[model samples]
Target: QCTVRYNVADCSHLKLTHIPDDLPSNITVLNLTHNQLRRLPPTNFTRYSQLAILDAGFNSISKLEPELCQILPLLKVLNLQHNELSQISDQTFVFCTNLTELDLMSNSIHKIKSNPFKNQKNLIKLDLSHNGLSSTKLGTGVQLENLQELLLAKNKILALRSEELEFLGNSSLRKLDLSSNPLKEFSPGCFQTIGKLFALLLNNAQLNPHLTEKLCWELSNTSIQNLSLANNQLLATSESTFSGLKWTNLTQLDLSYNNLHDVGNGSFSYLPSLRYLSLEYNNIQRLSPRSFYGLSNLRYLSLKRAFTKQSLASHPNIDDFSFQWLKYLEYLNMDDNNIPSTKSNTFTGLVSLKYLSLSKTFTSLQTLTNETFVSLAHSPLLTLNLTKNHISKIANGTFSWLGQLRILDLGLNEIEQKLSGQEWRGLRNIFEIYLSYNKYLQLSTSSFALVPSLQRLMLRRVALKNVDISPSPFRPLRNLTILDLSNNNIANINEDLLEGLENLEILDFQHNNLARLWKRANPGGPVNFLKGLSHLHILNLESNGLDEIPVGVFKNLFELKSINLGLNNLNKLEPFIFDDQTSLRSLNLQKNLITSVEKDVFGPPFQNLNSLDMRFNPFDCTCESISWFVNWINQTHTNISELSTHYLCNTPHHYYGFPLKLFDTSSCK
Candidate 1:
């Protein structure tokens, strides 16, 4: 019998075929992980009196026997993650009353029939994650009335009916994972029966398909505490459709990664309990004051990545009532949109806002006004993001009234190239500044002297080389976290450039013509080639001349979570690229000249992996090589929507659509 040990075990190279029949009867500690078992025996565990443990992850089991629950009636643990089970009969589990934990992560399970588990009232935890399930209409309620935890992530589910999801809310459901599905609609009456649900995930799906009417209905029917609707296709909707969500009792709602073009009047008026509302990655254009009239409880609101493919208006700004009714708005993001200028006092009623994001919104400085944001003086506005915009001028008193601002993100904007010292007089309290990706030849003397708390400065791609940045005016931040000067044409970066910032977490110098690390320096960390700051959670160094990633470059970065190294001159990924990395969650390597990725490039196990964009890379369509990716997506429950199928080959000869499983391989070639 396989002995049970800690929560983790090493069984990668094994190739088991069937369940060990002669194993101990009280086999409560079974662990046969990392095997190649194709089919389990029909007499599967019909009589294990004290069996409480089971682990069969990373296998090829095609079907589950009906007597599986009968074998260990008192079973408490079962792990079947990474398998190939496709179907389940109604009588699959007739007993197993004591089953508490079941891990079915990463399988090919499509449809869950009626009463798949009968009379199993004591079940507590169940994991059916990473499957090919489409939708759930099965009215047969689960008899496991005591079920608590259910993980159903990484599936092909498109819609939800009340009956299929009714069994779940009936039990004491706490943690539910419905991510990576193709869901676009929400039935109101479906979740009405679920009064005990706490956390629900609907991320990486197409939500708000029409006008968010279905969501308003669902939110009105049930009381959700935390709801995640990220990475969706939510644009605009009918104004009348949203009336259903009036006075809803929701706390957290995520509308990020959607196609939100505009928010109708009073769209979020009745959401009194809404605290954190994320609307990032949407196509938001104009914002009227009444857009969010009733959201009195809204604290953290994000409009990051809001964009439209058009130039700013040449005439005066329209009467959009920017923040008319938002009297209590604290945080706002208008990043990545088309809004070069505005009339006087555009943000009129936001008397309590603390942060505002106008990054990447403007295309030219011809449309800005000195009184555009004069109303902010009545309240305290701290941070302002104006990155990636076209601000050729900053009127004399453009920022003269801003007294309490701390952070200013003017990176990737043309303001640094043209604006003079008169414009900098208004932004007196600026601290951390970002001027990267701007058409700047040099910094103005008076502009650099006004900022008192000036700390870290980002001047990457600013077209500077061995320039004067010392002595008279330029001051550094006292507690700077990072200093990214990558992707610049600068030939020399003197020591006086960063002497003020004492506590620097990151100092990036990639893409510059620096032949060697700083010889005489007390830089916080290695100055050879900084990949990230010590506390930086994200780093981007694409198009750098890095032949290979340094070994200990990211070793000290305990807080580092995401990194990007695309457009590099690399041939293949080294095994030790991320040897001691633990906190890292995502990595990008697109637009590179890489050829292939070997098996187990990311060694051992990783749980927080949601996606890895490796598109635009050349790949071989061999059985052994492509098999790894196919099995990886199949097991990881990852959704590669478009690339899931190959493009049409030979035109009339054949054509393939999404989901390779729906394509005929013979004709695909």
Candidate 2:
């Protein structure tokens, strides 16, 4: 039975075997989803002439009934998704004059027997996704004069021809999505009619070297603003590839993850209004000065991971004037290339540049001379990243011209010796520095005295085996807020090593030799390495071979909120180990040899704890050892990350590999 209210008839999910009869004549919407009807009813719908919306999705109907549309002359929307539709005929909708939106997605449509939509000139949107549409021409009678959006994605379209789209020359099609098709080529002037198109998506179309050149020419006549050609196997582009093209209105272009090896000079000179360009993950080795000649209005350019495989030839090198044409450029990323050096005027005309990234994570580079960036004196640069390279030395005056720079990253290099303050004399506005991952790097008392405004320092993984620091070595860096010295293999740190770091809030000392803090001294000597860090908020000491927690080790960490002690050999923890850390919230104890934890191990209930990670430990499932944790886990509202996967039983063959939450604990009784 059908029910009508508010001018709508809803018969959805009623298990009906046929269309409901005697629907109200004033109803405008009809829903018939989840039915077993194999065909439309033979009764004429002249009584329901006011119907404007009909939904027959999720049905067994294989074909549309031609007589049903003859009675419903005012129908405007129809949904036929999730059906067994296989074909279309010209007389299907010959009487429906007002229909505008049609959805035939998720069907077995393979061919159009005739022009089924020739007379529906009022149609504005059509969806043919997830179908077997393989023909190049979309039939002769399929064009709508007012159609604005067409979705032909996820089809078997092999090629596109100009004659099929000639009918839409007077229409207003603006957006077209033909992605995920096996398109190989386009006929000349195929897109000449859709000149008013604004957005086009051709991603994953397999437009390798064969169709890349032809496709560029086909799209040159359109007024498109946004274009995406990502994941295509485009090999290279010569000047003529985009020659004679008209793209004065294009704004954004994406060509990432392609096989582009070279881009000829003046290749992008036709695009004067382009603002953003992405060339990441390409194999480009050389760059000609005129390659980006006409892109004067460009704002952002990314060249990351371009020449990561091997060094390029000698003559095509990026000379001092290679990027001088981009006078309004602001951001540039040329990281992860095999570039050995940069000339003095390499960044000559980038007057508005603010961010420059020259980091090499997957390549090796080792030199920087004093005259390398002499031409940057007239421009204004704020941030510079040169991390993950093989640089061992930096000649003076190399960065003297960058007086306005605030952030600098030189980590993961091989600068072995400590330097005097004169090496960083011109960095007056510098505040942050990263120098981690260097082997045998030593820091003296006056190593960074010239940088008075420095506030953050990172020296992790710098090979500090038994290295001793004098008292108050970092006294000049009084404003520092963060310090990292983890994985340095230090046997013992001087008591005054962090004496001047009163404003520091975060510290990391994980993966080091902390078990030898008092190996040769008194057996029960006190370990006061963190005695002065009273304002610390976060501390990490995971995997340091710690066999015991010394008394008062964390007595001064009053403001601590998070701590990580994972991957260690700690079998037991004293009850008063964390007595003073009252404000602690997050604790990580994963991957440890902890078998049992006392009920009062953390000084009664940790009321402030919000995140607790104890996965992958040798947890004893007995009542005495686990009763406290089970009660805490069930009572507290803390978030248990990876509770279902990582928290499992490892002992007692019967309970092994079983989820800890579902394990049988009756034996403990």
lDDT of 1 by residue, 112-223 (tens): 7667566566767877777777775434554557766666677777676676776654576676668877666666576776647667787776565553566666756555
Q: Which candidate is the best by TM-score?
A: 2
**TM-score between candidate 2 and the true structure:** 0.72
Give per-model TM-scores.
Answer: 0.59, 0.72
The total of clashing pairs for model 2 equals 0
* Top model number, lDDT: 2
| lDDT for each residue of candidate 2 in 521-574, tens digit (9 for 90 to 100) | 545575567767688898888888877776568776778889898887777776
What is the C-alpha local distance difference test score of each model?
0.62, 0.76
Alpha carbon lDDT at 5, candidate 2:
77
